[PDB]
């Protein structure tokens, strides 16, 4: 791997510099190198891994959505034939997106999840596995059912652990629930399930805010507001 000669600590340090420079593909490559050293990741390092790949895949998803919209308009009645180029370029972007998802899923399978024993690490990684299968599902049109079921399975395992091992205000638990609710609404065609999950999660967090410090309260309420924003859109 191109990062095999670089110290782990140097890869972490450069990931943080890349973040400051908004060089997210570099950040992801540094964090992939750090994972491939074989040691478990700290909380801070997990979050660098997630921020890096989320920014890379987010750019790809946005591009794919633009291209797919253009392609769909091209396939409307009375649209002029323009040749294979829009499909080809949408496919190019799609294939690159799938490649990034496969890279992340591969890091999780070899060997982040199997060595993660604490609830905070294991839930974090299982949520990531659900997220990247969800991004694969957004572009899938052929195995689609199996991709969807892989996302669902990862999210459900993360949910089961989080409900047993973490308080209802924990930010990783809250972000998991937020994302699993969007899976239900956008991917699984289950808007009622999405709404029920978001509601239950919000209400259970609200009842436990009284236990928190001012700083923890800020962290939890930020995610709660995201649940509220989706519930406003959906109801």
């Amino acid at each position: 791997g191109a990062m095999g000669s670089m110290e782990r600590a140097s890869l972490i340090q450069k990931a943080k510099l890349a973040e400051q420079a908004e060089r997210y593909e570099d950040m992801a490559a540094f964090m992939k190198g750090a994972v491939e050293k074989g040691e478990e990741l700290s909380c801070e390092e997990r979050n660098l891994l997630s921020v890096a790949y989320k920014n890379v895949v987010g750019g790809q998803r946005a591009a794919w959505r633009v291209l797919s919209s253009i392609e769909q308009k091209s396939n409307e009645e009375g649209s002029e034939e323009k040749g294979p180029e829009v499909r080809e370029y949408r496919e190019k972007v799609e294939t690159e997106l799938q490649g990034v998802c496969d890279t992340v899923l591969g890091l999780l399978d070899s060997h982040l999840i199997k060595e993660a024993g604490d609830a905070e690490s294991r839930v974090f990684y299982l949520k990531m596995k659900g997220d990247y299968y969800r991004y694969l599902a957004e572009v899938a049109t052929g195995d689609k059912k199996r991709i969807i079921d892989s996302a669902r399975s990862a999210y459900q395992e993360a949910m089961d652990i989080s409900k047993k091992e973490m308080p209802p205000t924990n930010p990783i638990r809250l972000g998991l629930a937020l994302n699993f609710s969007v899976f239900h609404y956008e991917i699984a065609n289950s808007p009622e399930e999405a709404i029920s999950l978001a509601k239950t999660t919000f209400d259970e967090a609200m009842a436990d805010l009284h236990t928190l410090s001012e700083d923890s309260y800020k962290d939890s309420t930020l995610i709660m507001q995201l649940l509220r924003d989706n519930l406003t859109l959906w109801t």
């Binding site: 921020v51 997220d131 972000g175 937020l178 994302n179 956008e186 995610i223 995201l226 989706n230 859109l233």
Partner: peptide, 7 residues
């Protein structure tokens, strides 16, 4: 719809 983290 909102999901966790940055875009």
């Amino acid at each position: 719809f909102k999901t966790e983290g940055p875009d």
